[PDB]
Design a protein around this ligand. Structure first.
Ligand SMILES: [Ca+2]
Ligand SMILES: [Ca+2]
Ligand SMILES: [Ca+2]
Ligand SMILES: [Ca+2]
Ligand SMILES: [Ca+2]
Ligand SMILES: [Ca+2]
Ligand SMILES: [Ca+2]
Ligand SMILES: [Ca+2]
Ligand SMILES: [Ca+2]
Ligand SMILES: [Ca+2]
Length: 524
């Protein structure tokens, strides 16, 4: 019973030392292809098991860290989860202030937990193993539970043997003993033990991180070969195609497509299109397309035809950011030899055309450091004066203020608008506009206020009725699996009482269900 003393007990966190003190040949560890070594491997792999789910593959976001704490660290229970004290713990783990926990502060956190208890399940087991290994030698010769130089040498020899080079002249061993002797007591305290384990883990990470990031046994040629045999089997092994494809990053899928094409001179996309059936074909082909390529193809689909798919166009042009939109524009010009803006102008008209065009330019101001309070208030009052206060609506003013301002500024703008208008921004949109413009504005504002909640809503909408709107469900499951899918699951389960996993289960069956569930990631 102690989560209440977990966001606080974490001191001033203060690799050079790792590879400098007792350097191990970079060629030695690169030509490099035991309970404590198993524990270190578990500690290092658990981090990447979550850091690579979304965004930066090497740092944890709040969602990823919450998932990790919940899955791998149920040892502490208390009042289940929280949101203020957990935010405090996330901010105390963030020594860099990048709003993300990287591997170094993750190691700081693990060291702090280990010092605490020094008085799934894998990682808890690794912590118990660290404590047990340290105190088996500490409580031997010399001070009780204080590593004496002799017992330190024994523990370093027959507990972590892999990291010791082939030759360990007594001079280098004593040099390492001295380097470890930070507190200058001639022995080793449990804190020095934890800092040494942190240095080893960070070395292992630098090996993993950067190059040879296939340390997760990722071989693109192996996957290409397995899926080629899965195509070339009786009735097609769709299970293996899914199990593999839908469990690699978009980049890993690019590498696998390249490997397949080099091995068979047939593009993986074409092979799986000619060898796949229906919605599973749609999921897989969307998963093969790179993000920008997928989005550009979806925009084209929504526009290419007699009419227009307002809903999908709206979703994509209102949920994509400036960088995403620039990449999408250029990929569009490549793929279809025409500008996305040109097709947007040719397929829509009026204020809806204006709003779509404006948003698609990806020229929204970037999130600034200063809060422009006077501008927040001026913009809220301008929105009120142009919409609810008057007869009619000044659509150009709304367009300007909602496409050009940043997102946090606009969130403040909306909370201020709530101070002048009795109807909030969504309600005011419903009251002042109609049709495609109204739907676009509702989407834009939902994206500006809470994008994971927005996608959780679109998913509930796709799955609540008779059957499914597989197009939308699939596009959200594909496009948000490596971005904010964890927060999407969080909001979905907050609002609708059941996990997105559960609604996927209930609405789709078969291998298509399994592909969607994999892209989901798990329950809740
Ligand atoms: Ca991440
Ligand atoms: Ca950080
Ligand atoms: Ca001792
Ligand atoms: Ca010392
Ligand atoms: Ca089959
Ligand atoms: Ca087909
Ligand atoms: Ca059209
Ligand atoms: Ca239409
Ligand atoms: Ca009006
Ligand atoms: Ca349904």
């Amino acid at each position: 019973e102690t989560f209440s003393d977990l966001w606080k007990l974490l001191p001033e966190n203060n690799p050079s030392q790792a590879m400098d003190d007792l350097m191990l040949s970079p060629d030695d560890i690169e030509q490099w292809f035991c309970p404590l070594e198993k524990a270190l491997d578990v500690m290092v792999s658990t981090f990447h098991k979550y850091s690579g789910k979304e965004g930066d593959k090497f740092k944890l976001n709040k969602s990823e860290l919450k998932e990790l704490l919940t899955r791998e660290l149920p040892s502490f229970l208390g009042k289940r989860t929280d949101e203020a004290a957990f935010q405090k713990l996330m901010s105390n783990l963030d020594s860099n202030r990048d709003n993300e926990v990287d591997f170094q502060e993750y190691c700081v956190f693990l060291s702090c937990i280990a010092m605490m208890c020094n008085e799934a399940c894998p990682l808890e087991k690794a912590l118990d193993v660290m404590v047990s290994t340290f105190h088996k030698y500490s409580g031997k010769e010399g001070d009780k539970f204080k590593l004496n130089k002799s017992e330190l040498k024994e523990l370093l020899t027959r507990e972590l043997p892999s990291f010791l080079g082939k030759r360990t002249d007594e001079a280098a061993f004593q040099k390492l003993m001295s380097n470890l002797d930070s507190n200058r007591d001639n022995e080793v305290d449990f804190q020095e033990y934890c800092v040494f384990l942190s240095c080893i883990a960070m070395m292992c990470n630098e090996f993993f991180e950067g190059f040879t990031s296939a340390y997760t046994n990722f071989d693109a040629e192996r996957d290409a070969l397995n899926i080629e045999t899965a195509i070339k089997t009786k009735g097609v092994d769709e299970v293996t195609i899914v199990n593999i494809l839908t469990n690699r990053s978009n980049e890993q899928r690019q590498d696998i497509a390249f490997a397949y094409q080099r091995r068979t001179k047939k593009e993986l996309a074409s092979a799986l299109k000619s060898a796949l059936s229906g919605h599973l074909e749609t999921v897989i082909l969307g998963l093969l397309k790179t993000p920008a390529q997928y989005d550009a193809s979806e925009l084209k689909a929504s526009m290419k035809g007699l009419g227009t798919d307002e809903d999908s166009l709206i979703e994509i042009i209102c949920s994509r950011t400036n960088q995403e939109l620039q990449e999408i524009n250029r990929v569009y010009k490549e793929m279809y030899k025409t500008d996305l803006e040109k097709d947007i102008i040719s397929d829509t008209s009026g204020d809806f055309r204006k709003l779509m065009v404006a948003l698609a330019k990806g020229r929204r101001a970037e999130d600034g450091s200063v809060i422009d309070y006077e501008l927040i208030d001026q913009d809220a009052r301008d929105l009120y004066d142009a919409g609810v206060k008057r007869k009619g609506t000044d659509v150009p003013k709304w367009i300007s203020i909602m496409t050009e301002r940043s997102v946090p500024h606009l969130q403040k703008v909306f909370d201020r608008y709530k101070s002048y208008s009795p109807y909030d921004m969504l309600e005011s949109i419903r009251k002042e506009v109609k049709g495609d413009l109204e739907n676009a504005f509702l989407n834009l504002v939902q994206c500006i206020q809470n994008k994971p909640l927005y996608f959780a809503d679109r998913l509930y909408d796709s799955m609540k009725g008779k059957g499914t709107r597989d197009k939308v469900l699939i596009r959200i499951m594909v496009s948000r699996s490596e971005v904010d899918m964890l927060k999407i699951r969080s909001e979905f389960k907050r609002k609708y009482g059941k996990s997105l996993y559960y609604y996927i289960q209930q609405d789709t069956k078969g291998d298509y269900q399994k592909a969607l569930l994999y892209l989901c990631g798990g329950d809740d």
